[PDB]
């Protein structure tokens, strides 16, 4: 009805960029991404002046629709043209940084995020208010430094992102998970308390959903005890999940299981683990009333094979909780999948700090079936192993298979020290616009 109104208006106006823009928003609402791009492109073209906010939003939406369609070169072209028209709009350099991040060029992304922060030269004025203009740069800077294993700068930017948007579970989850690597649970709870992570019982339960799944038993315990007036059946479910991490035999009423599902504390991975440990629980009945009775039948009754993603999700939970007996049970089931399944199993063990087990699986896999992450793991393992000959060998395998992935060129640069000059050049040939590579070439000329 709103669209039909706009389509009558554009029949008698045609030359109004604003009507076309409004049609693009409606196409956006209805998910017609192809027609939204065309309408937003027409609104930008028909603009009479550059000061219209909707003319700015047109370029932003064009860039986004292009980004959603993985047409990154064309998105960056739209972004750069728009930065030149409107140099005080931060969504355009933000989106450039995001594109660079998902295309694995972290130092170039980092550079842009930092310049968005505390910029006394450009008076940035947002054109959309989805998030606080400074949440996204801090969050992504924290993400980059974490991946670069700079845990201090990660925590600093994760905490500043939290100050901008304290209901974002994502950065809360990141700080807890990062701190769990290095600190006592009580120290982690004290940090959570003085920054007021647990703003309510509800928020505590959403946090508990992450901490139990990662196997943070003591921290989950301190969290749940700090909560007041938790509906008893939800408390029981939480207690049982914590007790399960500690290998207590799981005993839980059907009521606590059902409310544990309703609060999203219990998924099909939990139910399978509990059925494996305690066959008396009414879990078969519970699962078949939740459309996951196929999961039950595959894992326990020789039933038909479930999707590999769902099987890997049950396997992941067992690995993450340290449930090695159940994990071995689950691994015997892999032989009904194609051989390529062992590439993902290898990835799982490596993610949860089982590099030795993961290699056992990586050796099972034909090199064509190894994921990019797998290459990255094997390079990291071999560099930590001081076998830089073999490390560089896998990095070149990465370049040839995944010619567009930045990380394998960078690995070949960092390792092949007696050829760094040619390596940076070979990288620049595939990434002519990457600014870090030029910083690196300048550093070999300073050394040479």
Residue numbers in the entry: 183 to 630
Question: Which of the paper's sentences describe this entry?
Answer:
Based on the expression, purification, crystallization and X-ray diffraction screens of various GmaR constructs, we determined the crystal structure of an N-terminally truncated GmaR protein (GmaR141-637; residues 141–637), which contains GmaR residues 183–630 in the C-terminal part without the N-terminal glycosyltransferase domain. The GmaR141-637 protein in the apo form (GmaRApo) adopts an all α-helical structure with 27 α-helices (α1–α27) that are laterally stacked from the N-terminal α1 helix to the C-terminal α27 helix into a curved shape. GmaRApo is segmented into three domains (TPR, linker and antirepressor domains in order from the N-terminus to the C-terminus) and folds into a tertiary structure that resembles a duck swim ring. The N-terminal one-third of the TPR domain corresponding to the α1-α6 helices forms the vertically protruding head of the duck swim ring-like structure, and the remaining C-terminal part of GmaRApo corresponding to the α7-α27 helices assembles into a circle at the base of this structure. The N-terminal TPR domain of GmaRApo forms a twisted semicircle using 14 α-helices (α1–α14). The TPR domain is connected to the antirepressor domain via a four-helix bundle structure (α15-α18) in the linker domain. The interdomain interaction is primarily hydrophilic with eight hydrogen bonds and salt bridges.
Listeria monocytogenes GmaR is a thermosensor protein that coordinates flagellar expression by binding the master transcriptional repressor of flagellar genes (MogR) in a temperature-responsive manner. In L. monocytogenes, flagellar expression is transcriptionally coordinated in a temperature-dependent manner by the motility gene repressor MogR and the antirepressor GmaR. GmaR forms an intermolecular complex with MogR and prevents MogR from binding to operator DNA, resulting in the derepression of flagellar transcription.
